Structure formats: structure tokens, C-alpha cells
């Protein structure tokens, strides 16, 4: 039992973390087969970030400029290509440690693991959620650009995130591995407003089921509410509106606990309206929304890999 | 920027995680060189846990009984030894993936990363702290015995925890890798009193420094207090008493922010007495004590390993 924020095992991804330097700006890259993926603003300086012409800037770049390091193996970069905001450096040798990998675009509210690296070296792994406004609340210093987010299923590593820049607001934005940004952000260092952020309701219910499985049960009332009536209260407190698809995916936790999804919604109504009254849930005084229904199931059943 | 609870990259440890079975009781083990470390109550049944004679039970065990699995490799167990609550198995093959590793006993208040495994396969990694009463609040289902906790410095993996059993109370207990328990616990499934738990004060100050480094500054008062006057207030709210060694190790965070440690203590005193008044710190309504000063330094400067 017990319930912690769990991150995927990071071994498969460490073997792909390289350092890429182009001039005086050095950030991380992801080395799969004979290609190294990194953010295209590696070819900018601080002063180039205001209004970069990435097409012309890349044209001034030569393969010799791209210092790619693997631990301290130096890789002869033999090509450069621009796919959206991502720079694919063709290299001499294929990475012998290449895992089975997919390139996946995720949805707001889904969670992934982030391997934080600086100068091509991994320093930490942590779980985070793609907020509904497509930002992440992250741990990225200057030089953790190119750090990737991934999920793990069976033998396959599912790459979904690459970090590019910190926003003025202190939040982070990035792309899929085809280089398309999540959200309305771009790779310039300019004023960039994120959306009004909302709370991932379906994650919150799944976290409440997790708390019932782990003993914390004080928030259970003998109420119930309609889905359409629950949303009236959801909007008011800036919660994402619950759908029937969100109810359906909560089914399995509703089965394990014998608490109908709407019953659990009725407790959340009580929670949004009355607060926590000084109590906690799994040792937290706020409602947590960084666990998917899938994550809780994998933690209350022991889902493994390999 | 941003400040998340981070775990060490788990690659070095994933490669030593095996499955160990003895009858119908199966848990995880740690394969370093030609020895596999696992908790000795693997040689027990459910009914053996009440009052086990581990010496006589092991004598009744033969190497043919110990089913060790590494991925899909079956390992010849060729010997058995009892070091305290840990059973050291000889095997045919040295682990080709053996990292640089240490066997370290840690102190209360220090933190480590745990690679959670079930049936010998790694499933998750998370950061956690050894409480002052020598328990951990962890994510351990049934079959997560033998899962280890570790720190990483430079190239070296510092093994400090093996999990053994869930207490009645819902918290977990374990040993160092020489098999001596942390805290007064034993590997019997009996009523076991935990200590009165305290909040790791020096961890809380380091997390407060982390908050100023990341912009959250509302809790800074222009007050101050003495170390002995702060400790009077520490006792009342069940905080560990701050020592001068604790002040000294906050020195570097005190330097980066220009807020004297006693000044930060005076902010925390005010925090204990009046609460948070509906505000948060790094997006949390409770005081966090699962970060050492060393952890905050490693995240506010970007310390790596490689």
C-alpha cells in the first residue's frame, strides 16, 4: 500500500541522452539509431532568440559546428535537418543502446515521466502532467532544454515530450518529437501568454479512489448527483467538465471500491464547496490532479514492464 | 526554474533487479557481482511470519528451492548465507551490468530514491525520506519486498535501503544492505510500534530556501529569533530540534538568497503559529520536509552524475 507520485524506470532513456553544443549554447539531445533529436534553438545565442529566422540561421550552420557528446564519446555529425522546431542530426554511428521506441503526441491531462538532464547528463526523473493549457509545471534549469518526456508500455518506450524553453511566467513549454509545439507557444523568447489553466477533474476522481483504496475514507458522503449537475459546480471552481468518456475510464476503480462514479463526484462536490476542514487526503491538504485513472490502476495492482 | 520532487535516474539499478522465488512466496532481489541480496522472509510462508525461526527454516532450505530469475535468464543459486535479515545467494553468473556500488547505512532525515519492483521487474521510481522514527511512507504493494533505495554520487551507486514488510499501521520498514533493520522493527508479521514521528526541521528550511529561489516570497517576514527561542516553538508543533550542524548545512542556501538561517527560522516560527492563511508555497498548502539541503542545492544549480 501507500501512495506516492511514481515515475517510470528511466534506464532505457538514459542510454539515449547526449549533449549537443552549437557555439556557446549547449543543450541536451535524444539519440535514437543514427539520429540525434534536439531543439532547433541550439543554433541561436541569447541575442538570436528575439526574432530568429531558423531557416537562414540553420543555413549558416555546418556539421562541424554541432558538437554532439555521448558521455564523452564524440559523434561525427554527418547531416542536419529541420523538422518543425526539432533538429535531426544524422551521425556516424548508430546508438547501440537504442530501445524499442514510438513517437507519440499526447492529450491534455495525460501524464508522463521527464528525465531531467544538464549538459547531456541525466540528473533526475519525475512524473508530471501535461496541463490542459499545454504547459508543464517542471524542474528545468537553464540547460535542461532537450530533456524528453516518455511513457513505458511492455518493452516499448513512448516518447511524447521535448522541452524547449521556460516562459516568462515560470512554466515550461515543449513539442512532440516531430517538433510540433503543444499549445500556442513558439521557440522565441518573447511575451507568451498561456491559457487559463484548469484542474483535470478526471485525474482528481482517480486520486480520490486511490485514497479510498489506501484507507483515507473520511470524504465519503451518502449523496449522489447528476453528471450535468456536477459540472455546474465544476465550472464555478475552474474544474475541467466531466464527460461520459471520463466516467467510463473511471469504471474499473469504481468496480474495485464499490463507489459509483457519480457517488465519487458527489464527494468532490462536497470537497470543492466546503474545503477539507483541516484534514488531508494521502497526506495532502490540496486536491491532486496529476494521476490518471490508468496510473492509479497500475499502482493499486502492481502493473510492471518487460 | 520550477521545483519538483525528483528521483535519481534508475538505470544502474534496473539492471540488478531479479525475481526470487522460494515456494509460493516470491519477492525482488539485488544482483551485484555473483551474489543476489533479498529479504530472508522469502523462505517463509504467510503462516511462518508469526514466530519464524529463520535459522532452522534456512537449514531446511536447499539451493534447488531458490528460483532466481533475471529477465528470462535462470540463475544457478549455488549457496545460501544469512547476514542479519538478508539472505545472500550465490549464483553461477556474475552480473555483466554490475555498477560501481557502495553499501551505506543512512541517518534519519536523509532521503533516497526507491526503484519499485514486482515479480523482479521494475515498475516505478520515486523520491522518499527516512522518517525520524525510521519508517518510510512508500509505494509498496505485495511483492515489493526486496526493492531497494539508493543515492547516486558521480559514478557510484550508494545502496542504503531494502524494503521488508508493511506494518499493521500502513507504513513500511526495512534494513541496510548488511541486513540490520532501520528502527526497532523485526521481520515477523506482528503488532509493531512505530516511533512518534517528527517533522525534519532542517529539511523544511531547505524547502523554504528552495521556494525563495523560485519566486514564492510571501512568507518572508522581517522578524528574527534565536536558535533556542526557535526550538521552544519547535517542540510544541512536533518538529525536530534544529542543531548548529543543521544551521551550518543551510549555509550555502543562506548564501545564494541572502536570508540568514535564523531569519528563515523566524519565518517558519510564524508559519507554525499562524498557518498559511490560504496561500501556498511551490503549490502546496502543507510544509514539506522530504528535501534535504543537498537536494535543493542539486536542483537550484543543476548537479548531474553521468
Author numbering:
A (entry chain B), B (entry chain A): 1 to 306
Manuscript excerpt for this entry:
Mpro cleaves the polyproteins at 11 positions with a consensus cleavage sequence Leu Gln | (Ser, Ala, Gly) to release nsp’s, which are required to assemble the viral replication-transcription complex.
Crystal structures of 11 Mpro mutants provided structural insight into their altered functionality. We employed crystallographic structural analysis together with a high fidelity FRET activity assay by our group to assess the functional and structural changes in Mpro mutants. The crystal structures of several variants revealed the changes in side chains orientations of residues in the active site comprising substrate binding pockets, especially S2 and S4, which might lead to altered amino acids preferences. Accordingly, changes in KM values for most of variants were observed, indicating alterations in a mode of substrate binding. Also, we observed that the charge distribution in the active site changes quite dramatically even upon a single substitution especially around the S3′ and S2 binding pockets. This might explain why with most mutants we see the changes in binding affinities and not the kcat values.
